[PDB]
Amino acid sequence: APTCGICHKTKFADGCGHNCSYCQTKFCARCGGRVSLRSNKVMWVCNLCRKQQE
Amino acid sequence: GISGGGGGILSLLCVGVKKAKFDGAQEKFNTYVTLKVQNVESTTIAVRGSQPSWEQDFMFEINRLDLGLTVEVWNKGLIWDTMVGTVWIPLRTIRQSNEEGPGEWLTLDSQAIMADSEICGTKDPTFHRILLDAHFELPLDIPEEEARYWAKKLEQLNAKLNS
Amino acid sequence: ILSLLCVGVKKAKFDGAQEKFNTYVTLKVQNVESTTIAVRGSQPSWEQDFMFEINRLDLGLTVEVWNKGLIWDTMVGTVWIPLRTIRQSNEEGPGEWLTLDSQAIMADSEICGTKDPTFHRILLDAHFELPLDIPEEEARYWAKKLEQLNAKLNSS
Ligand SMILES: [Zn+2]
Ligand SMILES: [Zn+2]
């Protein structure tokens, strides 16, 4: 049972979840988001790192 | 240019296991619910009686909408457990929402309908019912200012790491 | 809903070193989007089937292949498949190898093609499932929509 490293509740199916591009914590859809740069680059950032940089 | 839009992939399945109503003597039941989806399994605690209330939420981050959520209600035994009943909910029938719902009462069936070794429904209705909610959530949106901040911050770090 | 579009994302073949690739495929039709998980190597195999409810046929299926990075994931290639071109069949197929292009072409903030071929290819099966019948009322609606794609409901 891999589980979101933020909420510790959501369980990931194999290969699901995203790693935070900053802290590398694997997170579920409730716990971080995506920043898309032009049409060819995307990064992922968890809500804890978001909070820190606010 | 730079977007914080989360887009529209439905990956987070939320399931609310509410309660059940069994036909028969209450001392006969000490039951739990198991949920299975995309080879992930979760379970409530066991609750006694003919009207158990679990009120437990479960979340699964998945990517295969082509399957279903198997729900099983099990009567706990000290040596073996015995299935009270089951339903199978195709993931394509599950609403997309941001809110918890009231659930619906579903009749529990006794047996899976199997085709080609995979479950595709259930059969042989019992007189028991379960109250269950399920919904998919959409990904979060990051506001544009905050997205631009993160893109620049981590572009600079990427540029530094590459050097 | 005129038809259910089935899309089988089978595998891909990348030019260059195995260890450079850890890739996933995303699909978009109208505002419905889907994704595979990431698989390592120069010839990853996803073998994942997707389905979309299609009501208009003048648009396309956008397919993107992304490569995971520590910070950024990078889009390694894309194709845009006009829906009107997809085979009409209930039968799954072996897929066709399609060369991945470097970027989308836009008309009015919206994809209308791709350009700049890469040396990477994707194996995709796509087909429209046959509807069971088309009620007289809906046939009139589809006849109008198809007749501006130089198309018309099969008389049978
Ligand atoms: Zn989470
Ligand atoms: Zn983080």
Author numbering:
A (entry chain C): 89 to 142
B (entry chain A): -8 to 154
C (entry chain B): 0 to 155
Lines quoted from the article behind this entry:
2A-domain homodimer at 1.44 Å resolution, designed a mutation that disrupts homodimerization, and solved the X-ray crystal structure at 1.78 Å resolution of a Munc13–1 fragment bearing this mutation bound to the RIM2α ZF domain. The X-ray structure of the Munc13–1/RIM2α heterodimer described here provides the first high-resolution view of a complex directly involving a member from the family of ZF domains that includes α-RIMs and other Rab effectors. 2A domain and the α-helix with opposite sites of the ZF domain. 2A domain and the C-terminal α-helix exhibit an overt shape complementarity. 2A domain and C-terminal α-helix packs well against the ZF domain. 2A domain arising from the expression vector used also extends across to make contacts with strand 3 of the ZF-domain, but otherwise is not well packed against it. 82–142 observed in the crystals is consistent with all available data obtained in solution, whereas that involving monomer B is not. Thus, NMR studies showed that a long α-helix (helix a1) and an SGAWFY motif at the end of the short α-helix at the C-terminus of the RIM2α ZF domain (helix a2) bind to Rab3A, and that the interaction involving the SGAWFY motif is released upon binding of Munc13–1 to the ZF domain. 2A domain would have steric clashes with Rab3A upon binding to RIM2α. An emerging theme from these observations is that, because of their small size, ZF domains may often use multiple surfaces to increase the affinity and specificity of interactions with target proteins, although further research will be necessary to assess the generality of this notion.
The Munc13–1/α-RIM interaction is particularly interesting in this regard since its physiological importance has been demonstrated and both Munc13–1 and α-RIMs are involved in priming and plasticity. Our results suggest that a Munc13–1 homodimer–Munc13–1/α-RIM heterodimer switch regulates neurotransmitter release and some forms of presynaptic plasticity, and reveal the structural basis for homo- and heterodimerization. 2A domain can in fact establish two different types of interactions that lead to either homodimerization with itself or heterodimerization with the RIM2α ZF domain. Since the Munc13–1/α-RIM interaction competes with Munc13–1 homodimerization, this model predicts that Munc13–1 may exist in solution as a homodimer that needs to be disrupted in order to bind to α-RIMs at the active zone.
